[PDB]
Amino acid sequence: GSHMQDPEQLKHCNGILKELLSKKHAAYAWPFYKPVDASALGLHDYHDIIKHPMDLSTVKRKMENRDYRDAQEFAADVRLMFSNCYKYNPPDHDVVAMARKLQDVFEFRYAKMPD
Ligand SMILES: CC(=O)N1c2ccc(-c3cc[nH]n3)cc2[C@H](Nc2ccc(C#N)cc2)C[C@@H]1C
Numbered sequence: 001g002s003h004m005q006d007p008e009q010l011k012h013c014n015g016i017l018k019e020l021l022s023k024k025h026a027a028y029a030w031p032f033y034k035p036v037d038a039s040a041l042g043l044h045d046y047h048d049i050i051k052h053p054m055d056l057s058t059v060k061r062k063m064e065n066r067d068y069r070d071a072q073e074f075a076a077d078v079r080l081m082f083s084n085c086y087k088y089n090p091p092d093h094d095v096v097a098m099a100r101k102l103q104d105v106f107e108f109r110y111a112k113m114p115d
Pocket of ligand 1: 030035036037041043084085094
């Protein structure tokens with residue numbers, strides 16, 4: 001059920017999203033900007049391993065469309081995006097190091113949620 005604080009919490013989420021997409025973090029955020037194009041990357045098993053793809057452009061579309069009803073729903077998609085990366089790729093891959101850095105940005109700012 002909607003809480004009177006959900007709009008303000010969603011503004012905090014939108015601020016986080018803008019930060020994740022900003023030039024400040026682009027050196028490690030870029031793999032997460034768009035859906036994984038498995039065929040283009042030669043990763044022909046990606047959709048057999050990853051049931052629910054997620055990426056920041058999809059999060060942005062969902063925010064713009066008012067799909068997220070609360071902060072926890074937004075956070076679940078951001079964390080799904082990172083989890084997919086940790087599931088599919090070897091833990092020493094460059095993309096995993098990038099994911100860990102971007103997830104640190106996310107988690108520390110998400111923790112500052114007004115509540
Ligand atoms: C997010 C994610 O898990 N993945 C993902 C997604 C998009 C893109 C992409 C976008 C444009 N081009 N490539 C590349 C990758 C990863 N591959 C690499 C990532 C970083 C580096 C360096 N430094 C080298 C390879 C493979 C992996 C399936």
